[PDB]
């Protein structure tokens, strides 16, 4: 008796409805009392309840969510997807062998936007440790498909780099990213100018911001 | 007021053993049955096990059973979990969660999860370097935070009292050591006529680090 969950990914427009499936490999309904719940989780928060026993709408929950379903089939329903309704949506059994889903991840689609690029030199502090870091942030695009070259004096670099992405953001559901370009010191010194490119789909010419240690 | 509160991060070595505890407020402790969910990034959540805090009944997953104990004292109303035999896929964050009925049927209220990292490297404090812009109406600040172990490291800007405009970046293990970073966008009117400082906290190693960031040159 496991949940499958469909689908892993569902990617939904504001305004549009969302609906994921859930399927118990074996009958677990006694319609009596049927223990099928859905749970949310945003990133950096707790799990929370949404809909007990299939239909059941806890407290302080929106009235676009909602529960159906019989047999071996439940329904998780989103009537009018909203941009703080992103997350990883979880079905769960609270009968015989608890057992959760795969779970589904809810992502907002959207207008395309270019992201803001800030470059930002060495700090004091670390150089006089013996290291040099540069970082890059390419803040609010989308699509989240985007790519970062470094650039020391012209030539293209491409050992030594950390990037990270940020998850949607649930207020204007776009995508933001940080390139590390780490150098020892010595390295970092011999070399005056650095450049931070992004190639975003909402351009074929990339969004340029550097810098030079001389000024 | 229904409150779960659960213990912080634990750093542990292969093969031993931890435990984390789950103290609950707000109703009658004894009455309800208590669950334990595992969370690791790409697995979703997972069931371990529940207890009966009046008489410490337990059941526990197949797939758990050996590898977590439940246990409760019901004088204190706190519930504990302990893990043996730790590997790498031991490494995740734990929550404990009550089990209603009447009102509802299911699992209202969660605590805020106990991370847990399985590894043999030694602990290290966060650097925290100021990013300031070199050489627009709004300025873009950051915080470089780097050369940690373990994770987690949490992040605020003057102390919480600004909130909007900030961007905090996942935490990346790169050969025993993470990094992280944060920016935070503001009117120019307000920097740097006004203080912007990171604070930066690191509960694994008991420290905390403040950065005031200053025009360069």
């Known amino acids: 008796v496991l949940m499958t969950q469909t689908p892993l990914s569902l990617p939904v427009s504001l305004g549009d409805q969302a609906s994921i499936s859930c399927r118990s490999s074996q009958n677990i309904v006694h319609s009596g009392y049927t223990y099928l719940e859905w749970y949310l989780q945003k990133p950096g928060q707790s799990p929370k309840l949404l809909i007990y026993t299939v239909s059941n709408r806890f407290s302080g929950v929106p009235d676009r969510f909602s529960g159906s379903g019989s047999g071996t089939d439940f329904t998780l329903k989103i009537s009018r997807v909203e941009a703080e309704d992103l997350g990883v949506y979880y079905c769960?059994?609270?009968?015989?062998?608890?057992?959760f889903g795969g779970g589904t991840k809810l992502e907002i689609k959207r207008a395309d936007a270019a992201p803001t690029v800030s470059i930002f030199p060495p700090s004091s502090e670390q150089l006089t440790s013996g290291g040099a870091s540069v970082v890059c942030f390419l803040n609010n695009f989308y699509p989240k498909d985007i790519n970062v070259k470094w650039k020391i004096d012209g030539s293209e670099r491409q050992n030594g780099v950390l990037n990270s992405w940020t998850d949607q953001d649930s207020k204007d559901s776009t995508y933001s990213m940080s390139s590390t370009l780490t150098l020892t010191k010595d390295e970092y010194e011999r070399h005056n100018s650095y450049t931070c490119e992004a190639t975003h789909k909402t351009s074929t010419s990339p969004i340029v911001k550097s810098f030079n240690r001389n000024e | 007021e229904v409150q779960l509160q659960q213990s912080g991060t634990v750093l542990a070595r292969p093969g031993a053993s931890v435990k984390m505890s789950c103290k609950a407020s707000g109703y009658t402790f004894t009455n309800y049955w208590m669950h334990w969910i595992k969370q690791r990034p790409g697995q979703g959540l997972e069931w371990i096990g529940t207890?009966?805090?009046?008489?410490?009944?337990?059941t526990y997953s197949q797939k758990f059973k050996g590898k977590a104990k439940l246990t409760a004292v019901t004088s204190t109303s706190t519930a504990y979990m302990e893990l043996s035999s730790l590997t790498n896929e031991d490494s995740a964050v734990y929550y404990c969660?009550?089990?209603?009925?009447?009102?509802?049927?299911?699992?209202?209220?969660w605590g805020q999860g106990t991370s847990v990292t399985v590894s043999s490297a030694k602990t290290t404090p966060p650097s925290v370097y100021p990013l300031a812009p070199g050489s627009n109406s709004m300025v873009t600040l950051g915080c470089l935070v780097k050369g940690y172990f373990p994770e987690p490291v949490t992040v605020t800007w003057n102390s919480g009292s600004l909130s909007s405009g900030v961007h905090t970046f996942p935490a990346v293990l790169q050969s025993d050591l993470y990094t992280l970073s944060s920016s935070v966008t503001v009117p120019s009117s307000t920097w740097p006529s006004e203080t912007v400082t990171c604070n930066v906290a690191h509960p694994a190693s008991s420290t905390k680090v403040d950065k005031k960031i200053v025009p360069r040159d």
């Open positions: 769960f059994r609270g009968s015989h062998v608890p057992t």
């Open positions: 969660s009550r089990r209603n009925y009447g009102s509802s049927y299911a699992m209202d209220y």
């Open positions: 207890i009966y805090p009046g008489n410490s009944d337990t």
